[PDB]
Symmetry: D2
Subunit: 285 residues, 4 copies
């Protein structure tokens, strides 16, 4: 028995839950799990509903057509899919291999429900070591200050060829152009370190070490034109002590970075993240 998930956001208005649940009811479906949230400050409503067939077995394509009538009337941004259909995910990497290694591990053991389409890098394959990607293809697309348009065009073509749904910047260090970021709105997740308090300028890990901080954090977010400043999906920290050398800070920074990105990716892949302007609504569990 197939389960489906619907997520949506729209301007707050009376009777949204009534409209959505009545549609599922009249179309012979049954609600398994659902959550709703009204952001009264932004005037937007948010819903996640997981459902399956009860009196009528209606295929996804028909339900979408049907639900599109409601979505249009309520000005909804929405998505309905079969919980079994894995999203096609592309992984971009530069030098650091920790987020890449963790995502692949989590995918391999059944914790991330996805189909990796490709591993893409601005550096050659042989700069990475200790990896067997099996049937996941690795692509080297070189780039410099004068060839960004050509390189982005190449990545964009591959995203299309592979029908990629999500791009993960797993410590990919080349900045995406405003246009490429715009094309990947809500479909590109980045990870970066975060400190309490923040350090700016050269050598942030050595400044943190000299400051004697007791925590190191990481922030996973959707990519926009503002460098490392798009909608935050998830944040977490791990402990730092007097015992930790600068080398230990780097290792712990890598650990919280991979933890936060993999958890963020899990929320995205489980249809738990909905954009709310500059922010996100995340239906956790």
């Amino acid at each position: 028995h197939h389960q489906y998930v619907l997520t949506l956001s729209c301007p707050d208005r009376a009777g949204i839950v009534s409209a959505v649940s009545t549609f599922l009811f009249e179309n012979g479906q049954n609600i398994l799990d659902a959550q709703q949230y009204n952001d009264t400050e932004s005037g937007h409503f948010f819903m996640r509903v997981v459902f399956n067939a009860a009196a009528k077995v209606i295929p996804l394509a028909s339900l979408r057509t049907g639900f599109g009538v409601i979505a249009a009337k309520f000005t909804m941004g929405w998505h309905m899919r079969d919980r079994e259909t894995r999203r096609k995910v592309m992984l971009l990497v530069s030098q650091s291999d920790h987020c890449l290694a963790d995502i692949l591990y989590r995918w391999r053991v059944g914790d991330l429900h996805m189909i990796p389409t490709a591993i893409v890098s601005n550096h050659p394959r042989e700069t990475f070591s200790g990896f067997d990607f099996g049937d996941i293809p690795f692509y080297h697309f070189p780039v410099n200050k004068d060839t960004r348009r050509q390189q982005e065009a190449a990545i964009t073509a591959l995203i299309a060829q592979t029908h990629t749904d999500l791009v993960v910047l797993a410590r990919y260090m080349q900045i995406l152009s405003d246009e490429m970021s715009a094309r990947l709105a809500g479909r590109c997740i980045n990870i970066h370190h975060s400190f309490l308090p923040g350090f700016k300028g050269a050598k942030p890990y050595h400044q943190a070490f000299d400051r004697g901080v007791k925590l190191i954090g990481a922030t996973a977010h959707y990519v926009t034109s503002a460098l490392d400043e798009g909608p935050i999906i998830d944040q977490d920290v791990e402990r730092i002590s007097h015992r930790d050398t600068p080398a230990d800070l780097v290792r712990k920074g890598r650990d919280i970075e991979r933890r936060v990105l993999s958890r963020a990716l899990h929320y995205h892949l489980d249809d738990r993240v909905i954009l709310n302007g500059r922010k996100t609504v995340v239906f956790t569990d």
Copy 2:
């Protein structure tokens, strides 16, 4: 503008969310926050809905009356209240004061939204020290093996006199009879310690110490006739190390009990807990 909370459980059936949301929509209310869960193993559906007036300001009494029609059709166990209405809570204590002290602290700082009605004990007031209950009254209801009926009647009368909504056993050590446990179904919360692995018999703290455990837990649950075994609301642990003496284990045991009970109490008071036979649905 007042906010209201509706909680409900019923046998699973198509169109429950349609019926409940259409009722609120047709009555000029707006949903602020809501959660639904379908327990497909037990065949029961669960909902929590927080709402307020939109096109129509309808009083609670009228909304309750209207919602009663829907509840009858779907055979719902339900509750609808104004979020600002604090529940009337009674605290029972015997000797240990840690849970009592924590709950009163959490109440005084705004973390537990309640009106304490009474502090009740099988022991005299002067066996407790370091407390100023202010305007919360303390009652001493003595009991022995032969006077359990009289003492429970005194407690029951006070519950009714004070319109108490919830009874918290804050390490109260007298076992409630099956009949009193039944009268308080879904309205009585207990706390007890829990180990990994479990220890049974005399001196469980000394067995835990000798076993060299690295955790101590606590479990908060609704009271039923099965001694310390009713529907589980919340469970948590805290760490134990080789540095911990038997006295340290007791102190850590009190710390986890107070934490888990106060948290369990918070979920109850915030209309996040729904009974599901021998279990609970907790919307966190």
Copy 3:
């Protein structure tokens, strides 16, 4: 049978542990637990040793005199005390009692081993609900731009009068002068909340809310001449979600502040904190 604690820091050199442990052994003491750490970046060594009498019961005063010889040789900053001697702690507070209430609660239930000497505020007594104040003396020492030297003189005099060992700024909002800070080096603890990333200027909670952060943190630290920037003792966070309004962020900020300050205070009171220049060594 009393337990003593020794803490120390000094420039790193071979044979420090040999010198300290040989001294305790030769003076008939027995080590119960101890920790040592060599900061190879700064070249300083740190030790914490808990001990009691074995073959010889020697008074604290005599052990201090004997240990002074070793401390001079190794250029040590050190402290030796009886663990049963409660430090005398002064609590400073402004308009919000959240940190003060938590400290008083933890003291009253036995979690913080101390003697509260006084509660000092720049606001009058009627500003506070007074829960858990009991018989602790309250002093309203008002201050403004023009009375700062006189107000600090009154605090400096109260500290000497009461023999205060530690001053806690329980979210006290008036800035201590540079000489006050200097006088209280290693003996004044402040607390402040922040976000990932931090915010500066008008309406900082509205900024965090607008940014859509998922964490709020707090930092406990020793006070120095730099505003809110001395040696960090403890840091922690708690979750923020899309459900939290700006008022909820204020509440959660208060909650993380009180948690971190109470824990930082516990470490200080348990002789677990040693200064390391701009940093700390915390033997948890």
Copy 4:
């Protein structure tokens, strides 16, 4: 400059710290990190000391010979090694690779410092996906009610041949004999999951699910003659909710088991665990 670590336990007596630290000092060594704990209930003293060369660069063999004089006098059980010498670890596994995959992942990414000598199973190689096995020797040593002595003889012979210092039961489901357990005392780590409270008999997951637990736990321990009851190294829990099915409890049980086993293994490999009768002393941070 190499770092060395010494761990020890002995009957409590005055001047243990004086004796050990005076030895290291007089032998030209410098203490980097050290911890001491007196179990006044058992009357035993515990120490961990990490050190390196100061005035005299003394080889390990010479320090051991020297320290052995002190260890004899104080009735010490002790160990001194170079922190850079990786322990040789044998991984035992049955039908589920959850603990094995996690250990192999953590080893490959640099989180666990060890040399895997071999993967031994009572099931064939085709049972496993083989992710991260790489060039680690695999051996199918089958066993039944009547071949236990011969199978353990094969394992015992492999341990000797490979110079194995530690055996990890990565959710290996065959019970090791009392003699086999005795031979591997302090050198064999097992993992098992449980609940608050525990359950016995048919369908243990269904009993937990029926009880409505909100936590699932795991315990890592050294193996003894008592089935699943040796010295506890580490324990931890994760959350269980009303949303979790019995199949979800199985998944979460595997997750808590691998997390606890990998952490316990890390403590063992970092020379942080000392046996204290039926308990352990674990120097964390």
